[PDB]
RNA sequence: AAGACCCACUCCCCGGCGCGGGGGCCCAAGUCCUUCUGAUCGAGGCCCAGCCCGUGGACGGUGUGAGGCCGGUAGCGGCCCCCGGCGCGCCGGGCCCGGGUCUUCCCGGAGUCGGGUUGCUUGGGAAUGCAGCCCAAAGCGGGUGGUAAACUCCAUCU
RNA sequence: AGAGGGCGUGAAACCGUUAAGAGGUAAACGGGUGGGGUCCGCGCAGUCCGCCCGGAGGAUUCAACCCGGCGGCGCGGUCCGGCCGUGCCGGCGGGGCGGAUCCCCGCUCUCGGCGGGGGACCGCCCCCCGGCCGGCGACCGGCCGCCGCCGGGCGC
RNA sequence: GAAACACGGACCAAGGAGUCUAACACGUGCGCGAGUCGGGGGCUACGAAAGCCGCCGUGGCGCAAUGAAGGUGAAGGCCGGCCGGCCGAGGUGGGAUCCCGAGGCCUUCCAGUCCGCCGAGGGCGCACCACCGGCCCGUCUCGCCCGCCG
RNA sequence: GCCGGGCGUGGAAUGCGAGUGCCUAGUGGGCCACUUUUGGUAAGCAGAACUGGCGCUGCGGGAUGAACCGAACGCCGGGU
RNA sequence: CCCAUACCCGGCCGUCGCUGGCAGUCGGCAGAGCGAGAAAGAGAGGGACGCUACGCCGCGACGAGUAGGAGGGC
């Protein structure tokens, strides 16, 4: 029974919804349970950081977000291979690894091997048995400054290149950006049918010559 | 808008009086010096007016400086500029009744059929 | 508010010490009971337990 | 002055907060209505009462 | 506030604001949006024209990220950069024009909706309109494409 | 994976033994002076400490209405068992292991996929999923790439 | 016990009784008066308030002065000085932050390219100043004066 | 159309019926304002509250529409010889308010200024309304031109 | 179709401040009368036109009465 | 000549209107007015009450009501 000018509404209540209403009075108590086991987690691994292993620098897919950078799952096996890290002594010193990743561009692959470089230097490795330090260990006086790292370890900053003002040349002044796009839009659409009409453009001569 | 109404000829000494509020318009570059009296001025519109050497007044200071309203221009923002009035008037689905209907979302399959296409029944 | 007056710190025994603190500008803010009565009678509803 | 700041110095311990503005500077209209600026632009009070 | 609602003033009045003749029954006209082609025909022609029928091509797997192109007008083009940038160009005498990276701000396409202050720019955008290209050229700037 | 040539340490894991959580019990200060009442936990007062305590003015009991009568409350308070945990040393074992380079080898899941068809299911639309019946594989193959089909390129997983 | 073993409080319907009144158009009701009770009015000799006159008293007693204290206002035509500025301005300044304004450590193929740290600049804030502007009636003291009030002496 | 030969009703007590959630629309109040909002997640007895976090605004709605779709995407004039400068964001009528002022407002009289006030007339014209233009998208007709890496 | 300029004794009487936009409940069984009027022998019948009533409304009158005649209502005193 | 809740007159309540009036309680820093038919200047060379302004005050006109709507409830 609609009234005068209104909006045609379709509420999704024809089912029996009043049996599956999830209320949220957990929410204030849920946060406390989360926080009090997040601190107890850090208490267990006290010198190791709170966020955990470091993540790689990762672009986004889906050309809406591809100008942005996230923290991916783990470093690819090529990134670890260049950096000189065994992929099984990698997770032990807090370096997240997933072999499912590939490297389609060295511009990103070079960007993470630098990241594994700095983390490998900024790390203070404790000796396994203190009375017998190995070669990989750190300097004994550096162990005293072992404070736990809070927050995401080496946080990713989506920084842009600070460029400076230029003086426009005659070429940039005389470039038809709109028409070149409409041109580029047209070629990538007709490229197929132009090949086919050019395919038998040679077939209508070879029957002519003989 | 008030810049547009104060650049009119027989003015530019008078004071701007508006009972509403003066929001900043980011699509204007130069700002003349102004003598403004409004109920409330947005934070950016203060900083852009005052940087141009202007003057912002409140209505208690307006009465002190001009009790009878002498030498002021009383203005008003666009009253029927709200989104709501585009639904008013004659109802849609009427000959020459360019009125926005209420739809839950716009798309190719929300009120593009029978009442609108001459191919589907009819149109107005 | 053409000026902000000068508040004097009092010692533990009730005397006024030599120090003087400038009155912070927050004490010169507008007095809005309508907002206070709005915000108070809508934040008091957030500590409330359910019942049914 | 750091949690809410003055009107010309934004609060340091908030993100981008600043004090609210006043809708009328000179609040007491008693000191206003007895001013020479107002009292010269007023017609005389017609207070002689007229009963039927 | 139940004390502000209407039912407080209807206590005592018999029909409770719903009439004696036409009582408040369960569903007189049907439930939901019923009777579209039927006894509610006039309401759907007078207030929802075009509600009934199909038009267009059914695109199956619509992934909204592909058709993502947030436009920016030339009116608010200089708002993408700081006021220090805008003044330091009209003060500069070498003709050094600042570059506005549109994509950095979040937009992709540039459309020309209004006037421009006459000082050159080199807008690093991804898509342009025709009129948008005219305004930037006519001011004396350049339109550079980027992907 | 093996071979050769280098580089680099050889100590981790099992079986025996010793040096907070649960329960019990305690912890401040008025029944002060008059005065009301059947009964006071009431009313008044306790100066120059405007009684006393207060890290304790939650609550309950008590012959009305109690911070100071009682149990408690507060305390990063004490005391007493009990269980777990934390390393260390001993005895008995198990345990000799890695990495890079080069060569030479090796490598995959079937009445299943897939196809037809019927029925159910799904937002899945010339069939998303599931199942029956018939058909029934391949190995530079196979699956997917949201329109049925051929051809040809890519991409992507196994 | 007007708490007497289903007992706190003990309503209405209904019933018993006592007291009052009425009673052939069923009762009840509206309006208007009348009569009768019921209690109350603590009703029964009915107003106080100024002001001046007249007659009898009693005080520590008025005015005007003297000293102390407190307050108000000041155009003091323009007192000195503070502090403050949602006032600007003047900085061989000292600063901490903001900016899409422009040498070096580090770095992947000594120069080209690159990341981090300084520096120059802009704008902001505040501070150390200098001087105007203005208030102190959203904020002050010492004076000076006029007035007032109180206290104490006199006065009698 | 009920006093009805229409139905419910012996009497008394207590109970007893437009609510809650979601969505939408409009009106209204408040804050901020080309922005706005942490609702989700974090951060340091009452308090399961409050505070805070923008290098937590991802995201929502808004700031731009139009087309079924590929897509496209919101002023112009004027001079100098397709090029170089200049003026450069509509008009008309009605419009609250404002603005100028032809004049004209008493102590024994005359001259007489500052300020204030009044006013025929004439103006800039808010919002909004009526109309004529202009611009973007779809589509149609007529055409005539320009651009370039293939 | 544009400009520009000039003409108010406001060009019948009477009365009265208008314009305009939102949101919107109830209703969508009606009934009666003068006059006009169709079917019907007719009907307190059925069906219309115009205006007013009743419904939604008491009051004085028609003894009585939804509609007739008068007249419409805050609570009161006097007059008519 | 009789009388209606009608009409006239008067009182009181309320609503509506005048988008009415009042900050002027301006006092020995004083001088008591703005009821006036006529666009504008009482212009300078010791003293009751009041005004919860969401208050107070003055004029007019008006008052039926189911369904329904709204406002106010010290």
Swiss-Prot record, chain A:
The modification N6-acetyllysine is found at residues 15, 176. There is a cross-link at residues 122, 144, 173, 176 (Glycyl lysine isopeptide (Lys-Gly) (interchain with G-Cter in SUMO2)). It is found in: Cytoplasm. Disulfide bonds: none annotated. It holds the Pfam family Ribosomal_L13e. There is a cross-link at residue 173 (Glycyl lysine isopeptide (Lys-Gly) (interchain with G-Cter in SUMO1)). Transmembrane segments: none annotated. One of its GO terms (cellular component) is cytosolic large ribosomal subunit. The modification Phosphoserine is found at residues 76, 105. Belongs to the eukaryotic ribosomal protein eL13 family. Component of the ribosome, a large ribonucleoprotein complex responsible for the synthesis of proteins in the cell. The small ribosomal subunit (SSU) binds messenger RNAs (mRNAs) and translates the encoded message by selecting cognate aminoacyl-transfer RNA (tRNA) molecules. The large subunit (LSU) contains the ribosomal catalytic site termed the peptidyl transferase center (PTC), which catalyzes the formation of peptide bonds, thereby polymerizing the amino acids delivered by tRNAs into a polypeptide chain. This is Large ribosomal subunit protein eL13.
UniProtKB/Swiss-Prot annotation, chain B:
Residues 86-124 are annotated as: Disordered. The keyword Lyase does not apply. Component of the large ribosomal subunit. The ribosome is a large ribonucleoprotein complex responsible for the synthesis of proteins in the cell. The keyword Ribonucleoprotein applies. It comes from Oryctolagus cuniculus. GO terms for cellular component: cytosolic large ribosomal subunit; rough endoplasmic reticulum. It comes from the Eukaryota. Component of the large ribosomal subunit. Belongs to the eukaryotic ribosomal protein eL18 family. One of its GO terms (molecular function) is structural constituent of ribosome. Residues 87-107, 115-124 have a biased composition (Basic residues). This is Large ribosomal subunit protein eL18. Keywords: Cytoplasm, Endoplasmic reticulum, Isopeptide bond, Phosphoprotein, Ribonucleoprotein, Ribosomal protein, Ubl conjugation. The modification Phosphothreonine is found at residue 94. The modification Phosphoserine is found at residue 66. GO terms for biological process: translation. It is found in: Cytoplasm, Cytosol; Cytoplasm; Rough endoplasmic reticulum. There is a cross-link at residues 55, 100 (Glycyl lysine isopeptide (Lys-Gly) (interchain with G-Cter in SUMO2)).
From Swiss-Prot, chain E:
The modification Phosphoserine is found at residue 67. The lineage of its organism: Eukaryota, Metazoa, Chordata, Craniata, Vertebrata. The modification (3S)-3-hydroxyhistidine is found at residue 38. Pfam families: Ribosomal_L27A. Its main location: cytoplasm. Residues 1-36 are annotated as: Disordered. Component of the large ribosomal subunit. The ribosome is a large ribonucleoprotein complex responsible for the synthesis of proteins in the cell. Belongs to the universal ribosomal protein uL15 family. Keywords: Acetylation, Cytoplasm, Hydroxylation, Phosphoprotein, Ribonucleoprotein, Ribosomal protein. The keyword Transmembrane helix does not apply. Component of the large ribosomal subunit. The keyword Cytoplasm applies. It comes from the Eukaryota. One of its GO terms (cellular component) is cytosolic large ribosomal subunit. It is found in: Cytoplasm. This is Large ribosomal subunit protein uL15. One of its GO terms (biological process) is translation. HAMAP family: Ribosomal_uL15. GO terms for molecular function: structural constituent of ribosome. InterPro entries: Rbsml_uL15_N (IPR027386), Ribosomal_uL15 (IPR030878), Ribosomal_uL15/eL18 (IPR021131), Ribosomal_uL15/eL18_sf (IPR036227), Ribosomal_uL15_CS (IPR001196). The modification N6-acetyllysine is found at residues 46, 54, 109. The gene is RPL27A. Hydroxylated on His-38 by MINA. Residues 1-29 have a biased composition (Basic residues).
């Amino acid at each position: 029974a609609p009234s005068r000018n209104g909006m045609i509404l379709k509420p999704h209540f024809h089912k029996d919804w009043q049996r599956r209403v999830a209320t949220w009075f957990n929410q204030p108590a849920r946060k406390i349970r989360r926080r009090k086991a997040r601190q107890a987690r850090a208490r267990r691994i006290a010198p190791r950081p709170a966020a955990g292993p470091i993540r790689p620098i990762v672009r986004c897919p889906t050309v809406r977000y591809h100008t942005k950078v996230r923290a991916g799952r783990g470093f690819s096996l090529e990134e670890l291979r260049v950096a000189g890290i065994h992929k099984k002594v990698a997770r032990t010193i807090g370096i997240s690894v997933d072999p499912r990743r590939r490297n389609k561009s060295t511009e990103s692959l070079q960007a993470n091997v630098q990241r594994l470089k700095e983390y490998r230097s900024k790390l203070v490795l404790f000796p396994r048995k203190p009375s017998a330090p190995k070669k990989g260990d750190s300097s004994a006086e550096e162990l005293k400054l072992a404070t736990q790292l809070t927050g995401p370890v080496m946080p990713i900053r989506n920084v842009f290149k600070k460029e400076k003002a230029r003086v426009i040349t005659e070429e940039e002044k005389n470039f038809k950006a709109f028409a070149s796009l409409r041109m580029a839009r047209a070629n990538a659409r007709l490229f197929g049918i132009r090949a086919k009409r050019a395919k038998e453009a040679a077939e209508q001569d070879v029957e002519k010559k003989k | 808008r008030m810049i547009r109404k104060m650049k009119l000829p027989g003015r530019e000494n008078k004071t701007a009086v508006v009972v509403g509020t003066v929001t900043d318009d980011v699509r204007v570059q130069e700002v003349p010096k102004l003598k403004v009296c409004a109920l409330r001025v947005t934070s950016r519109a203060r900083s852009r007016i005052l940087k141009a050497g202007g003057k912002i007044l409140t209505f208690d200071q307006l009465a002190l400086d001009s009790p009878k309203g002498r030498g002021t221009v009383l203005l008003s923002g666009p009253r029927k500029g709200r989104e709501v009035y585009r639904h008013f008037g004659k109802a849609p689905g009427t000959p020459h009744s360019h009125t926005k209907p209420y739809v839950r979302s716009k798309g190719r399959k929300f009120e593009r059929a029978r009442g609108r296409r001459a191919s589907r029944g009819y149109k107005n | 508010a053409c000026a902000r007056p000068l508040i004097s710190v009092y010692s533990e025994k009730g005397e006024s010490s030599g120090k003087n603190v400038t009155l912070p500008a927050v004490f010169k803010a507008p007095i809005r009971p309508d907002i206070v009565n709005f915000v108070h009678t809508n934040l008091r509803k957030n500590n409330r337990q359910p019942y049914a | 002055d750091d949690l809410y700041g003055t009107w010309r110095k934004a609060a340091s311990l908030k993100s981008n907060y600043n004090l609210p503005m006043h809708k009328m500077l000179n609040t007491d209209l008693s000191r206003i209505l007895k001013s020479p600026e107002i009292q010269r632009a007023l017609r005389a009070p017609r207070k002689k009462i007229h009963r039927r | 506030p139940s004390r502000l609602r209407k039912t407080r003033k209807l206590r005592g009045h018999v029909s409770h604001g719903h009439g004696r003749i036409g009582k408040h029954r369960k569903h007189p006209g049907g439930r939901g949006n019923a009777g579209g082609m039927h006894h509610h025909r006039i309401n759907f022609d007078k207030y929802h024209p075009g509600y009934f029928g199909k038009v267009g091509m059914r695109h199956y797997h619509l992934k909204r990220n592909q058709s993502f192109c947030p436009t920016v007008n030339l009116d608010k083009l200089w708002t993408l950069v700081s006021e220090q940038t805008r003044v330091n160009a009209a003060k500069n005498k070498t003709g050094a024009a600042p570059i506005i990276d549109v994509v950095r701000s979040g937009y992709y396409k540039v459309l020309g909706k209004g006037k421009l202050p006459k000082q050159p720019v080199i807008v690093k955008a991804k898509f342009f309109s025709r009129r948008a290209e005219e305004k930037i050229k006519g001011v004396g700037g350049a339109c550079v494409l980027v992907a």
